[PDB]
Structures are given as structure tokens and as C-alpha cells.
Symmetry: C3
Subunit: 485 residues, 3 copies
């Protein structure tokens, strides 16, 4: 007697198929990554720029609360709190702010350089400050910026700088807006004042916009800041009859590509990732994850799913081809060295001897299937999270519509891929068994009796060397013509 | 004699598979929604704001043609005609108009408040209007705004403030008048170096009027430019002008849960309900796909270019991969009406149609799951779709179209192919169940019966209605029947 | 004897499936297009506007180096060098430049018309030029524009208008000059507090000069900033200036059906035809995917990040899920050449390869439908892909890239997995057809033959060449050959 059978174990693993729910399977693999390392990590060897709770404007201008900040020269992304507490301490706005943040998102190379030393505003006053930028407890000011009247005169302030630094240079400036016609005079004397900034491509003329304004940080005046990239060997010319907030410093900058600002309160921790999320770093081969939408790096596709389990083993029983959980009604706890095999009854003994030839063919296939699903995913470097001013709501909605669109596609396709491939994995196993049963049946023929539950009853004594011929497809029909029927 | 067979009927329902076109199928399910209710409905309990044929600008400003408008405090989307007839009755422009529309798209909560009553402009004339905005047939003006003009030969500095104590964020709109010529300026305002000044915590603006000759629109060379701000709670807005200020009298308390969209159509609201609205009518459906109209609002099926997505649910209709259906069992049974597969027995007693409950149920279960899988996995959140761009945003509008088109092509392709593939496997599924049923009987009989051809066994013994039972329910015993009439 | 076998040949063609790699197949089909004709062609009958190495700005303003450009009246897309050498010869900027380029991307119909003849500027000097816009080698200027300067010591108000009586929407460009200093302002315009004022029905703009020291670009410290508008049919445009106006002499009649793209390349129009153009050449194809170049214009296959998409059409080439091919019938027959599956017979007469035309045809039709389904379901509409952004639209640009990349990922994945899943099913399909051919004969011969193994039956009787054909064409009477050697 020799039976064909398949593996069963104590697994409680469940998968879903197109056709069935909660099907207990022999072995499985989750292709959805859900674990991170809880650390904020550096990205391919380069750390993030950590802004504490300063805004980028606060940092670049030199808000006094950003004094103890720690400026690395390289950085691969930026960490900023959702709502930083130290930004424009003197109230105001920053032209094209979001475009600026996007520029500084990742950097070569970034170095602050003194370009217009303050002591050389010889004909103007330099120490103007404000209680809004106070340093316990005297009036101070943005440390990287500087001009008010000298006596009762404010000559035309006019300086220029040639970018001899060998790199592209960020440069920021501002114009002040007083509270009312008077206040202006006590600050700049003249009235029809202007601020003029120009380069090879830049040219701009601002005039003070006076208005009555509530007090922010105790002030009613405002400062509006602008910025430019000054190309190498180009010069920038400042000219002002008043209200100019001048830079003392510029910033050498070089860039490879772009990255993103990650909103979080976590802090750099000394590890590596190819993929960062505001919750922690992801290290995975898997094509999908559900940790968090706002990742930076080379990441798996984010998916709304919270389970993507591929079946690798077979239906686990205590079928398209009618064998597994079919005409062979049960699995074997006993066979523990393969997925399909034989169970013999002999004068010598019995009887579990797994079929290595076919079990490998399946291990290979199911291996290759899992790898196809994984190895076909194209994962380039992306940032995801973006920034939009309060008058770019539509644009922000477009971006959201886009991110939601791709989320739905990947979720749907991953969910369906898993369901379909699972149905086909179970059917694969069923077919592997059915064919084993057929390979024996087509080998014995008259020499055995098909019992019904997966077994052949031999019409002759079949010792061990006999089985070792049927198990390996060498059984010879002619050698047996004992007819007990 | 017992025979294995499968169900057939008078269906003409057709599906396509990867391998075959135009296949007649026993039962089918269309997973593409194609019908709408032609009504314009309220969305999850909340109505649209209906603008008649006013524009948002005319509504907010208080164009007198928008008097009968009917304002609601809540609304879940906006209905606006493609080209409304009543907007800026006095010609002009609205700064960041589209951003402002986008804001008003979906609203909590919305309430007009009188923040700067006309009568307190005591040092200026307030009744100034224009023939451009005439009410049969005297000069009028936008009802929510105040056209400050001179009183006598004077226009003192106009200066007022409002602190937002209203408990909610407040939309406020103002305007500056650009006169056609120097006389219109003097007769209206007296002064000449005029300016308008508006400031809040975050807002800071100063505008000076531009006198210049312009073609006449609605009989006016002058133009009015309007701007808006959201005034945060407990903040204040300060207005100051030496002339040319079009002041608000009112502000709008606004709260927002989320956002929505404007629906461009001629239709009107109509006392029904949906979770999904299109400019042609509402959609009530379980289905994952529709082809009614791309510009929907709400929780909607995916819009696809396709116009037939039919899933096979039953089997090939025959009045395969496993070789049974339209195969070694050459045809189906019109007569077996209680299941998908079953037996036909010939007995000394009777004969003889009997559905196989067990395996038919396996199939009802599996095909149910399959349809439920295709439908239940579709992730349908709330979206607006339609969007607004100015004439200087062609590129951005084009980016949006390229994106909507991109998703359309993806969903269309995927759905069409999903249907083709899953159809192929459904047929083969049924085929497989018939082959297995056949084999479940053969392995039971063996010697006790002979295999005839198309799914029939001829018993080598008498088998009464009680024996047939043992076969149909798998409890047949070989031993009991050792009559070999072979 | 009677044997059931299958086609084999000298194919080195390889495919991949979900389950196996580098599987040698009988016949295959590549669905990824990789060839182009390396030419810049006309698009559906219509040429591209060819800018040589001028920029659109240079061209529209009339840079002297753009004189010999050849202006077709129609064009379906634009050809521009990645970085043109002839643009604003006199330094400056162009307001809303990308929007203008996107507008001119594709055109009906487009013709230049003289709207404001130079000599009618009677109170002004009209011939001012620059060394920056010089023609070997005297100072010249943008040929389509007029640099109004003073006559003697006077610059009276400059004031002209134009009614668009041309019958089409008209493009009009003007500029304002920003001098280097007060003294340069005075020698050109006399007056110091100047303005440029332009108005239509919907446009109203007032510009004032920003005099200021700048580095020299093309030897010039000054700049010119140009603006543009579309003047509607029968509308008028008012120009008014006290100095610094760069007036248009010409306007551009323009009409549009739709929109298109700019193709950045060095290549030049070469006189052919395409529905699909890339910067590397045109694509003539039926296939659903290509990997030539992402920036296409026209109706194009989906661009995929893949270099092989190979569908199996034939079978596993053997010198399975159903256990027949490379299973219990261990190898394929190089012999049988006129079919995919067939029979081999041992006889006393001939012997004997005969292909089953009936079974083979069912398969040819099915795989034909499969390939066609994959190809014919793909929707290809006209798009431009390449887009343009100023350097203060980095975010918008990155948004566009995020989107293009996203569809790129989706299509690649879906196509790669499509090919693999359908290959696993194509092989199994052949395997099923062979297994079914075998069973079709087995269920026909029953006791009259013995089941050997390699899919061969041993006849228990003389079966001459005519008996064979009763098996092959599935019409074989068992009644007849009731002879017993067992």
C-alpha cells in the first residue's frame, strides 16, 4: 500500500482569496511593512538640518532665540516643528517663503559669509533694535540683519557686493513699515523713501506701505523680507533713502537635487536609513507599507491596507483540482520534510517519506512568485510632504487630490493582487498534489487498486526497494504480473 | 443509470474573457453604474448654496439682481451657471477670486453680520450709487458695500475699525474705485492724492487709485477692484481713506469642516438625497465604477471611459480549461432549476433531476465573494473634482487635466482587464466544479458502473431511489453491491 | 499505437512568468515599442513652429537675429533649443512668460498685423535703438516694437488706441524701460515722474519706472519689462505714457483649437508624418507601451520604465498545472509542423504525424484574443507631457514631476505584472489543451487500448490508417472493435 498526501501543521495563519475568506494556510508572508525603528535617522550618510523650534526665516534672519542652533554644512532634509515658536520676532512677512524653504530643502554645502560688514554703514546708524526681539531684557534685532538716521540726516545709503565666493549665494533684505507718518521721520527723516535692490536678473523697488495695524509682539510696524540667488561673479546693488533692513551676511549654497521639510519633534539619533517617516525610519524589502504617508527617501508604496498576506504554503487541513481538501480529504501532521509525499504500508514498516523532487519545484515557484511581486516595484527618491501659503489652497488641494489618487490605485491593486495570487497559490498546491497522484496512478495501472482517499492497494508484495522505485519514477510494470484478481 | 450535468437557461446575457469575446452566460452582474436620477439633490443631508444666475462676486457684494437669492447657513457645495448674468454690475475685478470661491465651496455655518453700519459714516455721503447698478430705475449699488463720497465740498479722512468679537473667523471684502477721469474724481471725492489703507494683524495694504481712460463696460469707464481677508477672532481691521474707498458694511462669519466644489449646471435643487451628485443627476449605487459624468461631487464610484463592465457569475450557457462544460459533458440542462450542478438518474421508479446542494453552495459562496471582493475593496472617499483657474493659469489647469486624465486611463484599463481576467476564471471555476463532481461519483463506483461518454454512468446493478441518494450525498458503498453483471 | 503530442521548434525566444524565469517558448510577442525614426516630423498634417535658436520672446518682439525664421501660419507644436542664444537682446524680463509660451504652443491660424504704425507718433522720436540690439553694426532694436523717446527737449503725453477690428482675438505686447539712473532718464524722456498706462475692457495696468544701478547685461544697465494681453474682437486697447513706454507696432491675430507642447531639442523638421513625436524621433506603432523617451507630444503608447515586455503566444518549447506538457508526455515533437497539438501513430501503413487543426485553431483564436485584449484596451489620447516653469515655480514643477513619476511607476508595475501573470496562464492554457486532447481520446477508446505512459495508447486490435482518422476527428465506434486480447 502507498498513499499520496500533503503537509499539514499547527499553523493558524489566515489568508484571503478572490473566492474565500479566512483560509488557514501552511505558510505565509506579509508583504506589507508595518514596523519602523522609532528613530529619526540620517539619510544615506547625510544628517537632517535640525531647526529646534525655529522657523527657517527665524534661522536665516538670525532671530536671537535661534542663537544656539547648530548649523551643519550639508543636510539631506529639514526638520521643523509644525508651528515653530521663533520666526519673525519682529512681525512681518517673507516674500515667496515657500519657494525659499523648498530651495533649502537639501544642500551640498551651505556656508554663511559676511558680505556687508555693518561698521561700514559710515553715514548711517546701525544699532536700531526692538523690544520684540529682546534679549533679557534689552531691545535687540535679527543678528544677520542691519539702518536709521544719523542725527537728523539719512543720506542715500548705497552699498554693493560682488559674489567672489565661488558659489551661488542666498541673500535676504527687508523694508520696514512704520506705524504712521511721524514715526517714519524720527527713524529716516525723509518721506518719499524707497528701497532699491538689483542684480543681473533681479531688479526691484519697494516703497513703505504705512497703515494702522494691531500690535503683534507689541509692535504695529511690519518688516517685509525678500530674497535672491546672486550668481557667481555677479554683483548686487543696494540703494535706499530709508526703511532698508540690510543683510550683513549672505549664504553660499550648492545643490544636487531636492528633498523636503519633515514636521516632527523627534531628534537626530545616529543611525542610517534609505527611508524616513516622522514616526521612525523604515528598513524593508517589501513593496508596501502603512506607517505614514509623509515619507522622505526611497520608500515602499504607502497603502491604506493594514494586511497584505501572500499564501506560500498550502491549505492547512486537519480546490480547483479536487485533491487538497478534496478526494484526498486530509493533510499529514507526520510528513515534516516536504509539502507533498507518500505514506506506505509494508511488511517492514511505515511510512512517511516526503517527495523531494516535486516539493522543490514548488518551493522554487512560490519563491519566484513572492520575488516578482517584490522585485518589480520601482522605488525612486521622493519627498511627498509639501508647503503652500494660505492663498494657494487650490494648489494644495490639487496636490492632495493627486496623492489621494495614487493612494487609491496602489491600495486597490495591492489588495486585488494579493487576493488573486492567493487563489492561484492554493490552486497551484492542489495541482501539485493531483499530479503526484497521477504520476503514481499512471505508473502502477493494473498492479494496484485505487482505494479512493488517495491510496493505491498493491496486488503484490512491495518491499522497501519496491517503494524506492515508485517514489522515484522507476517502478517497472513488467516485473509484476501476480494477479490476485 | 446516473448522469452528471450542469444548469442551462434562456439567458442571452453576454460577457467577454481574455480568450473569448461575446460569450453567452447563465447569469451575469454589471459592475458599471450608468443611470442617474436626473435630480439635483442635497448631499448627505446638506443642501447646495444655489446662486440662481448670480456669481459668487455678485452674491457677496450684494448685487441688487441677487436680492431674491435665498441664503442658507450650511450648504455642502455650490451650484453656479457656467456664465452667470449678475456679477459685478459696476465693472471691475476681484483679487484672488478663485481662491475665494474655493474657500466658500463648503461651509459649516455661515452668517452675515453688520460690522460697520452705514449710518455711522457721519462725515461722508453714503447714498451714492450708479446707473450701472440701477434699481428700476434709479442709481443703486452693491447692497453690502458703501460707496463713500463727499458731503458738501468735503471728504474728511474716513477712518473706522472693527474688532472680530463674533466668535468665528470673518470674511471681509473691500474695494477701491478707479475713476474714468479727473472730473469724476473731484465731483465724487473732492481730493486728489487719495489712498486707501487696510490693515490687520497679518494684512497690510495701501492702494492708490489709477485714473485712466478705459472702454465703457455697463456704461462705465471707471473700475472697482475688490480684495478680501479673513479676520481672525479678536483681531481688528482698520480702514483709512482720503477717497475712493468702497467700504464693507457687512462681514461673513464662516466656519469650515472641510472643502468641496462648485457645480456648473442650469438645473435646480429638487428635494432628494445622495452621497453622490453629478451635473446630470444624482447616483445611488453599490457599484465601484460609473460612466455618467467626470465632474462629480461626493462619495462616488470611479469614473471610467468604458460603457460595459459585465462580470460573469454563472457558467457558459449551453442549451473549457477542465474539459467538462461544452466538453465531455456536451450540453446543459434547462430542466435542473434548483442548482448549478447536479444529477440525472434513471431508475425503475422515477427519473430524475436532482441538484447537488453541496457543490452548488460552494459556488454560490465563491462567486459571491468574488463580486464582493471586486466591489468592497474600492476605496471611495469624498472628492470635488471640478476646479477653477483664471485665464493666466492655463498651465496649472492643464496640469490638473493631465492628472484627471491619467487616473481615468489607469482605472479604465485596470477595470476592463480585471473583468476580462476574472471572467475567464469564473467560467473555468464552474468548469472545474463540474469535472470534480463527475470524478466524485466515478471514484465512488469504479467497477459497480460503466463510463458511457457524456457524463453518464450505467450501473451494473439495480439502484433504487434510496440507493441513488447514497450516491448524490457521497454515502454510496461499493461492498453492498457485488453483483457483477460484467 | 496512438500518441498525443505537441509542437516544438528551434526557438530561443524566452519569457518570464509569475512562477519561472527564462522559460523558452515556442513563439512570443513583444508589446514594448523601442524603435523611432529619428526625425522631427509634422503632427497629423501640421508642422511645428521652428524657432531656430531664437526664443519665443525674441521672435515675438522682433529680435534682429530672428528676421529669417520662416513663419508658418499654423503649427501643431513648437521646437525650441534647450537654451536659445537670441532672446531679449536688450536685457529684461517678460511678465507671465510661461503662460504666454503655453498659449502659443499650438495655433489655428496666427498672423502678424500692423496695428500702430510708427510714423503716427508725430510728437515723438521713434528711432532710438541700442548697441545691445545692433545689426552689423549700427544700433537697432526689436523690429516689432517702438522705443518712444523725446523730440528736442520735449516728451508730450504719448497717447494712442486701437480697436480690434481684425475679426480674431489679438495678442499685443508692450514694455516699460527701466533706466540706469536719473540722468539717463532725463536724456531719454525729459520728465522724471513717468508712468505707462494700458487698459482694455478687462485689463488695467499702470507701471512706473524703477531707476536703479544694475550690473551690465549685454553692456546695458537698463532693463525692459514686457507685458502682454489678448485683445478681444471689437475691444479697444488704450496706451498712455509720459515716458518709458516701449510701444508695439504690431499685434498677432490668433485662434486656437486646443493646446500642445514645446519640444526641447537641437534637431530640425525633416518632412515626414507621425501621430506621436519624441525629442529623439517619431513613433509609428500599434503597441501599448514604449520606452523611447518620456517627453512625447501626440497620441502615444504609455511610457514605461522597462526594456522588455514579452508575451508568450506559443507553448513551452520542450526538446505544468495540468501535468501534460513537460510532465507525463515528457517532450515535444519537432516533427509536427502544421499545428500546436496533434497525434503520432504506429501502424502497418504510414506513420505518422497529424496535427489537430480543430484543437489548434481554438488556441490560435484564444491567444490572439489575449494579445488583442492587452493592446486594444489601452486608451491613447493626445497629450504634451513636457511643461515649463519659471525659477520661482520650483514647487509647481516638482508637483508636475511627482505626478509624471507616479503614473510612470503605476504603468510599469502593472505592465510587468500583467505580462508575468498572463504568461503563467498562457503556458497553463496550452498544457490544458493537450491534457484535454489526451482525455478526449482516452474516453473514446476505453478498453480497446492500453494506457502506456508517454500519452500513448496500445490498440487491442488492428487499426489501419483509416481507423486512426476516426480517433483524430473524434468519431470512433467502440461497438465495432469489440475484440479481446485481455
Amino acid at each position: 500500500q502507498i498513499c499520496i498526501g500533503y503537509h499539514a501543521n499547527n499553523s493558524t495563519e489566515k489568508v484571503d482569496t478572490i473566492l474565500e475568506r479566512n483560509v488557514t494556510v501552511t505558510h505565509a508572508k506579509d508583504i506589507l511593512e508595518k514596523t519602523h525603528n522609532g528613530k529619526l535617522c540620517r539619510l544615506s550618510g547625510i544628517p537632517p538640518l535640525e531647526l529646534g523650534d525655529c522657523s527657517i526665516a527665524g534661522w536665516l534672519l538670525g532671530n536671537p532665540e535661534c542663537d544656539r542652533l547648530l548649523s551643519v554644512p550639508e543636510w539631506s532634509y529639514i526638520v521643523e516643528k509644525e508651528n515653530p515658536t521663533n520666526g519673525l520676532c519682529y512681525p512681518g512677512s517673507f516674500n515667496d517663503y515657500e519657494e525659499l524653504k523648498h530651495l533649502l530643502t537639501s544642500v551640498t554645502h551651505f556656508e554663511k559669509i559676511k558680505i556687508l560688514p555693518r561698521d561700514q554703514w559710515t553715514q548711517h546708524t546701525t544699532t536700531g533694535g526692538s523690544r520684540a526681539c529682546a534679549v533679557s531684557g534689552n531691545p535687540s534685532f535679527f543678528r544677520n540683519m542691519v539702518l536709521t538716521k544719523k542725527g537728523s540726516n539719512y543720506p542715500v545709503a548705497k552699498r554693493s557686493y560682488n559674489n567672489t565666493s565661488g558659489e551661488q549665494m542666498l541673500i535676504i533684505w527687508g523694508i520696514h513699515y512704520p506705524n504712521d507718518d511721524t514715526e517714519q521721520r524720527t527713524l529716516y527723516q525723509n518721506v518719499g523713501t524707497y528701497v532699491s535692490v538689483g542684480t543681473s536678473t533681479l531688479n526691484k523697488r519697494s516703497i513703505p506701505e504705512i497703515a494702522t495695524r494691531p500690535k503683534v509682539n507689541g509692535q504695529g510696524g511690519r518688516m517685509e523680507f525678500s530674497w535672491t540667488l546672486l550668481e557667481t561673479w555677479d554683483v548686487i546693488n543696494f540703494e535706499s533713502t530709508g526703511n532698508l533692513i540690510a543683510p550683513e551676511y549672505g549664504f553660499k549654497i550648492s545643490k544636487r537635487g531636492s528633498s523636503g521639510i519633515m514636521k516632527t519633534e523627534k531628534t537626530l539619533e545616529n543611525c542610517e536609513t534609505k527611508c524616513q517617516t516622522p514616526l521612525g525610519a523604515i528598513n524593508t524589502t517589501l513593496p508596501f507599507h502603512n506607517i505614514h504617508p509623509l515619507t522622505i527617501g526611497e520608500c515602499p508604496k504607502y497603502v491604506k491596507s493594514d494586511r497584505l498576506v501572500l499564501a506560500t504554503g498550502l491549505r492547512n487541513v486537519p480546490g480547483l483540482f479536487g485533491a487538497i481538501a478534496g478526494f484526498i480529504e486530509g493533510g499529514w501532521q507526520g510528513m515534516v520534510d516536504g509539502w507533498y509525499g507518500y505514506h506506505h504500508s509494508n511488511d517492514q514498516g511505515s511510512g512517511y517519506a516526503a517527495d523531494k523532487e516535486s516539493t522543490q519545484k514548488a518551493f522554487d515557484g512560490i519563491t519566484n512568485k513572492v520575488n516578482s511581486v517584490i522585485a518589480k516595484m520601482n522605488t525612486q527618491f521622493e519627498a511627498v510632504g509639501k508647503e503652500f501659503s494660505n492663498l494657494e489652497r487650490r494648489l494644495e488641494n490639487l496636490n492632495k487630490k493627486m496623492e489621494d489618487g495614487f493612494l487609491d490605485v496602489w491600495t486597490y491593486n495591492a489588495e486585488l493582487l494579493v487576493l488573486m495570487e492567493n487563489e492561484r497559490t492554493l490552486d497551484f498546491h492542489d495541482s501539485n498534489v493531483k499530479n503526484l497522484y497521477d504520476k503514481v496512478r499512471m505508473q502502477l495501472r493494473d498492479n494496484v487498486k485505487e482505494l479512493g482517499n488517495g491510496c493505491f492497494e498493491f496486488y503484490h508484495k512491495c518491499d522497501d526497494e519496491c517503494m524506492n522505485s515508485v517514489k522515484n519514477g522507476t517502478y517497472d510494470y513488467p516485473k509484476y504480473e501476480e494477479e490476485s484478481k
